């Protein structure tokens, strides 16, 4: 909420998670706020997801700005356990990063575009 | 007063202790109950 500056439509969120699910089966994806954070820093990240029900919020407050000053696109998910499920985890995940998609590149691209438009 | 069952048990014991040292103990030890109490001269507890 303090780090969220725009609302993502339930639909867009749908496509992204699906794209993320195919990304783990095809390309490469990072699971966890630490790994997600390094990807953005190492630049090896194309799309980073960030749950919105993270408490305490400090765990993710940094993602947004760190991503901006790295051109890396990011998107918010409402639930924490969905991102974890979609990431292929048996647990939740505060953040995630698609480290080079796979047969989803087209989709990931659009999502990033759709977001920038959503300001 | 009104005595409870427990109070009564305690009073009963005090009554029992308040007895003479058997005569045979006298012989056996070849020669006094130091805890002899009187209802009037003394005061029990509780």
């Amino acid at each position: 909420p303090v780090y969220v500056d725009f609302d993502v439509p339930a639909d867009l969120e749908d496509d992204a998670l699906e794209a993320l699910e195919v990304a783990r089966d095809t390309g490469a994806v990072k699971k966890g706020t630490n790994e997600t954070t390094k990807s953005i820093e190492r630049g090896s990240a194309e799309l980073v997801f960030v749950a919105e029900d993270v408490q305490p919020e400090e765990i993710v407050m940094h993602i947004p700005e760190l991503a901006d000053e790295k051109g890396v696109p990011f998107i918010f998910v409402e639930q924490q356990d969905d991102l974890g499920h979609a990431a292929g985890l048996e647990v939740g995940s505060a953040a995630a990063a698609v480290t080079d998609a796979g047969e989803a590149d087209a989709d990931v691209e659009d999502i990033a575009d759709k977001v920038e438009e959503l300001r | 007063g009104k005595k409870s069952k427990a109070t009564k048990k305690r009073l009963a014991k005090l009554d029992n202790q308040n007895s003479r040292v058997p005569a045979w103990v006298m012989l056996k030890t070849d020669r006094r109950n130091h805890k002899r109490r009187h209802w009037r001269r003394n005061d029990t507890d509780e």
Binding site: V2, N34, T36, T37, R42, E57, E58, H62 | -
Partner: protein, 194 residues
């Protein structure tokens, strides 16, 4: 590269600036409505907790404790005292508030042992600290190479005997040389002059 943790750390170096400022302004409103000791599922300052020994595991508990701000809450002398021992207002206690917080927490969880604690802010009338407590009776912990030490009998009620990190600092045990002549090995053994 920088860990995600360093970002939590760096945020807390200035709890009065940035997003953290807004978080605290929001949070404290709720904290003020909470009790004296509230157990919480996750540390507010993750980097700090892990740094102090915290682990996401069975037998590890975190609780936020609040304590009234200010100096001593002492009652004026009812019997004769020389001017020196008549003070009441500016007299402060010898234990810092964090230590009082660690003890209250440990009282709430009689079976747990204090591992460490850290500050999470304050307002004008109280201070909050989160305390990490460990269950010395849980096998997940009895089998931990990093925490099983706290299961030893002589570690029971460690907070009440000043064996915490906050305890040791407050007893003037930081320095190994000059200035610790009356603190080490204990305040009591040195006649209580430290």
């Amino acid at each position: 590269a920088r860990s995600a943790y360093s970002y939590i750390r760096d945020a807390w170096e200035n709890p009065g600036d940035g997003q953290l400022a807004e978080l605290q302004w929001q949070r404290q409103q709720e904290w003020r409505n909470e009790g004296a000791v509230e157990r919480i599922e996750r540390p507010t300052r993750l980097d700090k907790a892990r740094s102090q020994g915290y682990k996401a595991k069975q037998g590890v508990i975190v609780a936020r404790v609040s304590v009234r701000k200010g100096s001593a809450r002492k009652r004026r002398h009812k019997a004769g005292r020389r001017s020196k021992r008549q003070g009441v207002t500016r007299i402060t206690r010898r234990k810092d508030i964090q230590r009082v917080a660690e003890e209250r927490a440990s009282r709430t969880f009689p079976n747990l042992r204090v591992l460490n604690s850290y500050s999470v802010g304050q307002d004008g009338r109280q201070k909050w600290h989160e305390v990490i407590l460990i269950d010395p009776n849980h096998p997940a912990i009895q089998n931990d190479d990093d925490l099983s030490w706290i299961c030893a009998d002589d570690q029971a009620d460690r907070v009440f005997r000043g064996l915490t990190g906050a305890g040791r600092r407050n007893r003037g045990l930081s320095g190994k040389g000059k200035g610790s002549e009356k603190t080490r090995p204990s305040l009591r053994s040195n006649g209580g002059k430290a």
